[PDB]
Write a protein that binds this ligand. Structure first.
Ligand code: B99
Lengths: 20, 338
């Protein structure tokens, strides 16, 4: 399932901002 | 049209503070360090106690030298100048701001409720009525910000706090900027970046409305519309022009999201002739009483557990670090106006 795929991903925690 | 009347008065108030920003309204020794509530490349947020009043605040400490290295001088000046000038029910208030030899300080109201991110991840996902409640507040907040020529550029559950009344408190104006034309800075969060940002194009406030689409999706689904292990993979999905919705998504919700997550700027909701009204009048917001939301008269779907003014249970733990203040002034000219 898509949920299972997300939970198994490495981006389920707090996501950092990006910039140049 | 009473909205135009409200926004008119709101802009008058904003412009006066914008042209004459408040500076040096407190000192570090007036606060008691308690606990770190969060940390990043720059800088860190701590729970502090103001001895004079006994009030608890969230104090962000920015290392001036680190800000310079990351080339975030102008962005930092943007954040402070904007925060001290804005005034809205769903925006965290800036109480004090000051600086010393080494650091910049911003003291804002503390929200023990914690981030939406934490609650969303734990619960899994919000019901559509639940997500609608939060979404409505963001819609009004963006209407307010955009009318002041302000672009936010960092919408995400991590930057949304839940107060004692169950309402949203927007935080982190690190990428906020006042601009009437287009802008070009690559900034934001991968999952929430609009296609035009990824493609290095000149973009406008339409990027905020795209972000709203991503937020609503994540709230209702429990996961972002575009996710992967690496940002590069996420960008590929964003620019592909395709999106898939969970089966439990209502017809109205999917229609709204297809209009917000629209690659074509000439078709994206919030950026058309009717402006924000295209969103506020959408079928998915049919039951939404916008005036009641603004007045905070609507009953919140969720109320965080209260354990005291200084309780930090709703926040994760972080490693504590000293607050060092050099004997020599650092980057004086760079942050003169702070
Ligand atoms: C916990 C809390 N209560 N009231 C608050 C008002 C603002 C902030 C706050 C949030 C923020 O973004 C937090 C999250 N994006 C993580 C993050 C991004 N950049 C950072 C830089 C330093 C530390 C954390 C982060 C950023 N700043 C604030 C804040 C607190 C006081 O003034 C601004 C936290 C508050």
């Amino acid at each position: 399932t898509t949920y299972a795929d997300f939970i198994a991903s490495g981006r389920t925690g707090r996501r950092n901002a990006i910039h140049d | 049209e009473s909205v135009k009347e409200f926004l008119a008065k709101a802009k008058e108030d904003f412009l006066k503070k914008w042209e004459n920003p408040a500076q040096n309204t407190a000192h570090l020794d007036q606060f008691e360090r308690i606990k770190t509530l969060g940390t990043g490349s720059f800088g860190r947020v701590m729970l502090v106690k103001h001895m004079e009043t006994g009030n608890h605040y969230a104090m962000k400490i920015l290392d001036k030298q680190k800000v310079v290295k990351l080339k975030q001088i102008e962005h930092t000046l943007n954040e402070k100048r904007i925060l001290q000038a804005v005034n809205f029910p769903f925006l965290v208030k800036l109480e004090f701001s000051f600086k010393d030899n080494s650091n910049l300080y911003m003291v804002m109201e503390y929200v023990p409720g914690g981030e939406m991110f934490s609650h969303l991840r734990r619960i899994g996902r919000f019901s559509e009525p639940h997500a609608r409640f939060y979404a409505a507040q963001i819609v009004l907040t963006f209407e307010y910000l955009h009318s002041l020529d302000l672009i936010y550029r960092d919408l995400k559950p991590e930057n949304l706090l839940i107060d004692q009344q169950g309402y949203i408190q927007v935080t982190d104006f690190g990428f906020a900027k006042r601009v009437k034309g287009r802008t070009w800075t690559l900034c934001g969060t991968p999952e929430y970046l609009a296609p035009e940002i990824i493609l290095s194009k000149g973009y406008n406030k339409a990027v905020d409305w795209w972000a709203l689409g991503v937020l609503i999706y994540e709230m209702a689904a429990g996961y972002p519309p575009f996710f992967a292990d690496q940002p590069i993979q996420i960008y590929e999905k964003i620019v592909s022009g395709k999106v898939r919705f969970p089966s439990h998504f209502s017809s109205d919700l999917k229609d709204l999201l297809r209009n917000l997550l629209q690659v074509d700027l000439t078709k994206r909701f919030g950026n058309l002739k009717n402006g924000v009204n295209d969103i506020k009048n959408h079928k998915w917001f049919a039951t939404t009483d916008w005036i009641a939301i603004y007045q905070r008269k609507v009953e919140a779907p969720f109320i965080p557990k209260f354990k005291g003014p200084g309780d930090t249970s709703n926040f994760d733990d972080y490693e504590e670090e000293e607050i060092r203040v050099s004997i020599n002034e650092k980057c004086g000219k760079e942050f003169s106006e702070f």
